[PDB]
């Protein structure tokens, strides 16, 4: 019975791990694009502002 | 803002140097020839996928 219990616990932990995996999969595709959009906005602001030369 | 000004000076001077050597007629002809060769290359590139369709 306790063997079955440990098996159930490990199954649930596996499910949680896979859920976090899916989270990271969903975050990766768009965070990089947003990072690049931020750099483009920074370039635009640098070209617009008169800060420095 | 020193680095920026120095870099702009360098680039402006290089641009002026390379612009005082740009002959209009000769480089115009060469640009036309380059355009022609690029067209040939592009046409082959398109044929590449025109084949994959069949």
């Amino acid at each position: 019975a306790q063997q079955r219990t440990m098996s159930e616990n490990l199954r649930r932990n596996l499910a949680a791990l896979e859920a976090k995996i899916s989270e990271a999969k969903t975050k990766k595709n768009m965070l990089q694009a947003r990072a690049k959009a931020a750099k483009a906005n920074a370039e635009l602001q640098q070209t617009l502002g008169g800060l420095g030369t | 803002a020193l680095f920026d000004r120095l870099g702009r000076v360098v680039r402006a001077n290089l641009n002026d140097l390379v612009s005082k050597a740009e002959d209009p007629e000769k480089v115009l002809e060469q640009a036309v020839i380059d355009m022609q060769e690029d067209l040939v290359q592009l046409r082959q590139a398109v044929a590449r996928t025109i084949a994959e369709e069949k």
Partner: protein, 53 residues
């Protein structure tokens, strides 16, 4: 002597942290009965549609 006498207790006390983690995860992750309820719910309407067809 009888290294078991000590090792067994070591593993038994590691099982304590194991059970604590299990309890935390389960208290934060009750989704099984709800999933099976959704399964029953959907199966009902699916059987209705099967009979209709």
């Amino acid at each position: 002597s009888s290294a078991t006498s000590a090792f067994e207790r070591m593993e038994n006390k590691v099982l304590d942290m194991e059970a604590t983690s299990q309890a935390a995860g389960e208290l934060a992750g009750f989704g099984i009965e709800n999933q099976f309820a959704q399964l029953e719910a959907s199966s009902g309407v699916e059987d209705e549609l099967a009979a209709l067809k």
